[PDB]
Ligand binder design. Structure first.
Ligand SMILES: [Gd+3]
Ligand SMILES: [Gd+3]
Ligand SMILES: [Gd+3]
Lengths: 400, 400
């Protein structure tokens, strides 16, 4: 029974430390939040986080080549065996120069990035300290990670490195991401997305004198028309959009360079690949069609295909033990686990066939990704919410 | 017989003054060229030109409400009778801030706008002076005009005012524009053009969460695709283009506003109108089709139709006396007249049923509308070329 961990003496002792040092945890939320971490600019926060992982007593603390900070809670099993990884991301959505100063308002704390995902960073440190102080023994090692690149164009670069290049790539057999404050959260699905800019070029020419030459505007417009005839099922949810366009200089000239940006997403890797392949075929057919319709005497239309965003789709089956563990603990805590799809760091693990769930840090929060983001650190709910992830984690690593 | 004007004592005496004061003409080319006159910013050059029109001895010199400068060479007929208008435009294609300093290079003068159309402004002043000094008597009044708005977005606003609103609008029965340096040119046809910006709007939305809503990008793309199936005759030459596009913010959203700029032109007013009506119908059908194919629950696609350019098409029949006069004088001057279509100030007069030709100022020039434009003012060729338009003009007004 996974929820039995909640009645073990070690868990109960660890919760009492989380309780005792909740004020330390809040101080660390504030400290980390005020070290800004825009996309691709996480190094300063990673350096501070690595020092805090060392101060929590973790072993082998280091920052890897991608910029992830990590430390190990060593278990009782053989060195190098299967391990559990739990990550909270260092980056926020907010660009460099965003003023970040926490404003206290009763038990509420207002600052960009404080809930997605800085609180989770502090919650994981609190776990590591409470586990060590209470003497918890786990069967599998736990790798605590502050990872880079969950947000925006980071495109999961940190977890991609952790799980395909880094020292733990062959050991992670259970992956958790702690993202956001909702501790009832159980993200078992990953929405994938593929994004492209298509730049169409042609010879150009005077719009009167050279009327009859190919026009890349038309190949581009034809692409959009056929793109919106691609079938898209309602379930698994599958979507696409023609979203941004530009090009041309004036009505005196046939354009020689124009572009369109396209989005495609799906809950299903198979549906996403199908849309992506249909799209790429449409781009090529639209170019061929323009070169057939008008004159290529001054040169043909060509298209440059540039990928501008890439996240895999995937899902952890509801019968997987990691999901069973999260479900059972969240239920035993009196919350309602409702499995959902999202686009989170767990998408990467899912795409590798690694069992993976994204969970929440606890408490109340709102307006994530907005300049008026805030969390409530009133102790009763903040502490109780933080105890949820600890139970899920220890159920999954196993305790002695 | 029209070229008999070239053997009249008055013409021969006038040419001798053009010769004697050819150096003044060159000085006035330079002076006027160095007063920049970008589109809509001709006022400074117009004021200088009006002072020069007074100094040439013309009567009733004034700047009209649109900004055209003009003066009258009074003929021997009744006041208020039919008149000849001859115009050279004050504006150039070059935007404000273009550095303009004439560079002398042997007998060449290099400066933006010096040939199209500043040399013509100085040539018309030289005619007015030489006619007065030699005592030329003409039957019809001649209205000498430095007009605004021939180039680009000016859209013939100057000649439009002169011939539809101004004080001479009902007296001009022959219209000449002197535009460019090629004195063998005889532009008897006017290519018309209509230019539009179509702005397509919709509600926007999250590109995943709101997938299924209408997208104005698709109505716009469909417009272009069907626009390029509009039939366009080769004779009378009829053309169109989809030339400039923009809109959208990122692949995370369905766009709420996008635009496309369209060109359409023809030698024939009727062919031009057919394309324009087919285009506007396609815009409406594309909006209707998008509102049928996707959801209007957050609001429908709409299209704002904005005309951004309008120049009428037309032609002066080769049997008109004004064309016979031009043809005969150009032949008698040893040049080869090949009547042609272009887009010039004469389009306006043509569209009003006023006999109209665009002619050249004489001499050699090149790279009109480019930053490296130049003319050659070597006297033999420059003077002989300038005498062509004088003969055409006097043949048309009549001399006694
Ligand atoms: Gd305390
Ligand atoms: Gd996040
Ligand atoms: Gd011009």
């Amino acid at each position: 029974k996974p929820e039995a961990v909640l009645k073990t003496k070690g868990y109960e002792a660890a919760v009492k430390i989380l309780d005792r040092d909740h004020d330390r945890m809040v101080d660390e939320i504030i400290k980390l939040t005020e070290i800004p971490a825009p996309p691709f600019k996480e190094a300063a926060r990673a350096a501070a986080y690595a020092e805090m992982l060392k101060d929590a007593g973790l072993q082998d603390v280091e920052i890897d080549a991608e910029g992830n900070a990590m430390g190990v809670y060593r278990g009782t099993g053989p060195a190098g065996g299967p391990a559990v990884m739990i990550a909270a991301h260092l980056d926020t959505v907010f660009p460099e120069g965003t003023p970040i100063k926490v404003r206290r308002d009763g038990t509420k704390l207002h600052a960009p990035g404080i809930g997605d995902d800085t609180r989770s960073l502090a919650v994981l440190l609190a776990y590591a300290r409470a586990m060590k102080e209470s003497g918890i023994k786990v069967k599998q090692d736990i790798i605590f990670v502050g990872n880079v690149g969950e947000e925006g164009s980071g495109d999961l670069r940190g977890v991609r490195y952790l799980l395909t290049k880094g020292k733990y790539k062959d050991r992670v057999k259970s992956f958790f991401s702690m993202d956001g404050t909702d501790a009832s959260r159980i993200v078992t699905g990953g929405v994938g997305s593929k994004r492209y800019r298509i730049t169409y070029k042609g010879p150009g020419g005077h719009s009167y004198g050279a009327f009859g030459l190919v026009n890349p505007m038309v190949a581009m417009s034809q692409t959009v028309v056929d793109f919106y005839k691609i079938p898209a099922p309602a379930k698994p949810k599958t979507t696409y959009a023609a979203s941004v366009t530009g090009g041309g200089t004036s009505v005196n000239s046939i354009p020689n360079e124009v572009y369109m940006e396209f989005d495609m997403r799906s809950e299903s890797p198979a549906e996403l690949a199908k849309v992506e392949q249909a799209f790429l075929a449409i781009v090529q057919k639209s170019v061929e069609g323009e070169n057939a319709a008008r004159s290529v005497k001054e040169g043909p239309i060509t298209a440059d295909v540039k990928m501008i965003g890439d996240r895999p789709a995937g899902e952890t089956a509801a019968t997987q033990q990691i999901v069973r563990n999260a479900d059972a603990v969240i239920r035993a805590k009196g919350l309602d686990p409702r499995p959902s799809f999202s686009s989170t760091d767990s998408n990467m693990a899912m795409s590798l066939g690694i069992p993976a769930v994204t969970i929440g840090s606890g408490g109340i929060g709102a307006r994530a990704h907005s300049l008026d983001e805030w969390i409530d650190v009133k102790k009763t709910k903040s502490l109780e919410g933080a105890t949820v992830g600890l139970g899920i984690l220890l159920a999954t690593a196993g305790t002695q």
